[PDB]
Each structure stands twice: as C-alpha cells, then as structure tokens.
Design a protein around this motif. Structure first.
Motif, mmCIF file in Angstrom:
data_model
loop_
_atom_site.group_PDB
_atom_site.id
_atom_site.type_symbol
_atom_site.label_atom_id
_atom_site.label_comp_id
_atom_site.label_asym_id
_atom_site.label_seq_id
_atom_site.Cartn_x
_atom_site.Cartn_y
_atom_site.Cartn_z
ATOM 1 N N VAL A 66 63.058 -67.940 -29.254
ATOM 2 C CA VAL A 66 61.857 -68.505 -29.476
ATOM 3 C C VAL A 66 61.257 -67.371 -30.229
ATOM 4 O O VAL A 66 60.755 -66.344 -29.498
ATOM 5 N N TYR A 67 61.407 -67.125 -31.454
ATOM 6 C CA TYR A 67 61.324 -65.828 -32.326
ATOM 7 C C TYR A 67 61.047 -66.168 -33.784
ATOM 8 O O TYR A 67 61.721 -66.795 -34.457
ATOM 9 N N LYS A 68 59.836 -65.649 -34.039
ATOM 10 C CA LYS A 68 59.287 -65.576 -35.560
ATOM 11 C C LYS A 68 59.016 -64.253 -35.861
ATOM 12 O O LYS A 68 57.810 -63.793 -35.234
ATOM 13 N N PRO A 69 59.523 -63.591 -36.921
ATOM 14 C CA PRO A 69 59.006 -62.124 -36.871
ATOM 15 C C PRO A 69 57.689 -61.976 -37.491
ATOM 16 O O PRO A 69 57.117 -63.028 -38.148
ATOM 17 N N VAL A 70 57.023 -60.756 -37.428
ATOM 18 C CA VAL A 70 55.633 -60.780 -37.553
ATOM 19 C C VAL A 70 55.370 -60.057 -38.976
ATOM 20 O O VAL A 70 56.194 -59.121 -38.970
ATOM 21 N N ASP A 71 54.573 -60.284 -40.010
ATOM 22 C CA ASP A 71 54.262 -59.897 -41.241
ATOM 23 C C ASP A 71 52.817 -60.027 -41.500
ATOM 24 O O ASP A 71 52.186 -60.810 -40.812
ATOM 25 N N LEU A 72 52.295 -59.318 -42.409
ATOM 26 C CA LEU A 72 51.010 -59.510 -43.086
ATOM 27 C C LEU A 72 50.926 -59.704 -44.513
ATOM 28 O O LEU A 72 51.871 -59.190 -45.262
ATOM 29 N N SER A 73 50.204 -60.641 -45.089
ATOM 30 C CA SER A 73 50.037 -61.023 -46.358
ATOM 31 C C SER A 73 48.624 -61.266 -46.788
ATOM 32 O O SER A 73 47.860 -61.694 -45.893
ATOM 33 N N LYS A 74 48.373 -61.007 -48.123
ATOM 34 C CA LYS A 74 47.130 -61.080 -48.829
ATOM 35 C C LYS A 74 45.794 -60.575 -47.935
ATOM 36 O O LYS A 74 44.914 -61.087 -47.589
ATOM 37 N N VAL A 75 46.286 -59.491 -47.248
ATOM 38 C CA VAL A 75 45.228 -58.499 -46.597
ATOM 39 C C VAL A 75 44.780 -57.571 -47.922
ATOM 40 O O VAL A 75 45.301 -56.656 -47.923
ATOM 41 N N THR A 76 43.513 -57.804 -48.548
ATOM 42 C CA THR A 76 42.756 -57.067 -49.370
ATOM 43 C C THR A 76 42.093 -55.717 -48.885
ATOM 44 O O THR A 76 41.623 -55.763 -48.000
ATOM 45 N N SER A 77 42.517 -54.733 -49.726
ATOM 46 C CA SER A 77 42.043 -53.215 -49.281
ATOM 47 C C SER A 77 40.536 -53.221 -49.867
ATOM 48 O O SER A 77 40.249 -52.434 -50.616
ATOM 49 N N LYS A 78 39.502 -54.260 -49.355
ATOM 50 C CA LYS A 78 38.250 -54.362 -49.932
ATOM 51 C C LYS A 78 37.216 -53.321 -49.131
ATOM 52 O O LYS A 78 36.014 -53.538 -49.188
ATOM 53 N N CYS A 79 37.828 -52.046 -48.892
ATOM 54 C CA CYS A 79 36.697 -50.950 -48.799
ATOM 55 C C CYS A 79 35.734 -50.574 -49.563
ATOM 56 O O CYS A 79 35.989 -50.800 -50.711
ATOM 57 N N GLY A 80 34.869 -50.198 -49.225
ATOM 58 C CA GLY A 80 33.451 -49.768 -50.152
ATOM 59 C C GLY A 80 33.753 -48.547 -50.934
ATOM 60 O O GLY A 80 32.928 -47.833 -51.461
#
Lengths: 49, 112
Positions: free
Chosen positions: A11-25
């Motif tokens: 029971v396994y789904k690997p983890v990743d990140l998508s469309k995380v915008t670098s929206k720092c000021g």
C-alpha cells in the motif's frame, strides 16, 4: 490440493510536490519616481531698465 | 581735520535754551549745569547702508522669506522698485561726496 493464499502487495504511493510557486516577496517591487527635478533658485533677474 | 564738505562752510545752525536738562532718576545723579545735543547730515550713512543693501541683494537673489510678504499683500515687482530707488539713493550719498571741479578762468574769446 493447492494450500490457500500467501500473497499481498504494498500500500504505497511515492511522494512528490507539483506547482509549488516560489512566491516570496524577495523581488516583490520594481517601481520608482525621481526625487524632483533640477532647478535654479539662488539668482536675481536684475531687470533695472 | 574733522572732515567736512568744502562747499558748505555755513555747515551749522544753532540753538541755546535757558532750561537745563532733567535726569529721570534711577541711579546716582550728576549735578548738571549745561548740555549739548546735535543732528548731523554726513556720508557715513553710506557706510551703514552699504551692507543693508547687499543683505537685500542676497535675500532677494535667493528669494528667501518672500512667500510670507507676498501671501500677505505683495508682488515681487515691488521688491524690485524699492531696491532700484535704494540704488539711486546709493549714488545720491556719493554725489554729496564729490569734491567739485573749479569753474573760474573759462572764456569765449573776442568777436571781431
């Protein structure tokens, strides 16, 4: 007779990140207006006809 | 040695009053008998005005403070006329400093 079962799968789904915008000021503004223009104010006209 | 204009030897008017001065008390009093007061027209007044004049030149060239005066009933052309006549008056106390030229010994020659 074949004895029962003995088979599962993980029971396994690997983890990743998508469309995380670098929206720092850090570069959040660019606009400017000058601190007024150059002018002369120190001299008289001396307009004695 | 007390320098005076050569073309007014009549340089004095005079007045003699019998009543002695009073001091307004506020200290020890001197026992006064006779006193002198004097009015004098001189070109030292030119030495006084020589700075007050350049002070008006500096102030007016920089237009310093002129918005208080203007706001309260004036125009810059009035600051010019006043200074212009004060430049005429500068030449007036210099004209009364002129050691004047001689007029004696000038003639036409004879008609024939």
């Amino acid at each position: 007779h074949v004895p029962g079962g003995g088979s599962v799968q993980i029971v396994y789904k690997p983890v990743d990140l998508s469309k995380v915008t670098s929206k720092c000021g850090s570069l959040g503004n660019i606009h400017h207006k000058p601190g007024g223009g150059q002018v002369e104010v120190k001299s008289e006209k001396l307009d004695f006809k | 040695s007390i320098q005076f204009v050569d073309w007014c030897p009549t340089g004095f008017k005079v007045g003699i009053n019998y009543q002695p001065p009073t001091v307004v008390p506020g200290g020890d009093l001197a026992k006064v008998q006779r006193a002198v007061c004097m009015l004098s027209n001189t070109t030292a007044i030119a030495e006084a005005w020589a700075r007050l004049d350049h002070k008006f030149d500096l102030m007016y060239a920089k237009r310093a403070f002129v918005h208080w005066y203007v706001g309260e009933g004036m125009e810059e052309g009035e600051f010019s006329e006043a200074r212009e006549d004060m430049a005429a008056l500068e030449k007036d106390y210099e004209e009364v400093g002129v050691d004047s030229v001689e007029g004696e010994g000038e003639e036409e020659g004879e008609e024939y």
